[PDB]
């Protein structure tokens, strides 16, 4: 993921929060990622995760059951929603 | 709670997902829910929580953090959502 930048600066791709989305609803449904298939629709990147060599970089996917709204939010900035 | 009946049914009622809800955001917050002046917007019931009584009943509030959409969902079926 190191191997993705833009002018230099390291970034998560932006779909990098699909995969942690779609990650995390199969997790909450308690099926494996690989046999759910999903459909994300307007997702909204409102910044850009700066990836940091030799760092560790926490970010929260937070999934509404039955909507399906989710938001990937690293601390309390949002980085994509949809 | 058990005072508040509908033709002979008891109820839950409509604006009682809305403290549900009032509670649970100040409790997110970390202050006091009667220190914190809230607004629900386009609040849905969807159906009707029935009181039992000398019974225990147990709902799920989730309240997103940044944008304030809400759901409270007895078990895995949806009373409001605003």
Redesign the interface.
Same mark, same amino acid.
């Given at each position: 993921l190191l191997e993705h930048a833009v002018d230099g600066r390291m970034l998560f791709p932006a779909t990098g929060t699909l995969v942690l989305a779609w990650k995390t609803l199969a997790k909450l449904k308690g099926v494996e990622f690989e046999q759910l298939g999903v459909q994300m629709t307007n997702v909204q990147i409102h910044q850009a995760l700066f990836l940091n060599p030799g760092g560790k970089t926490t970010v929260s996917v &937070?999934v509404?059951?039955?909507?399906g709204?989710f938001?990937v939010?690293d601390g309390?900035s949002?980085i994509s &929603?949809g």
């Open positions: &937070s509404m059951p039955i909507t709204e938001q939010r309390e949002l &929603s």
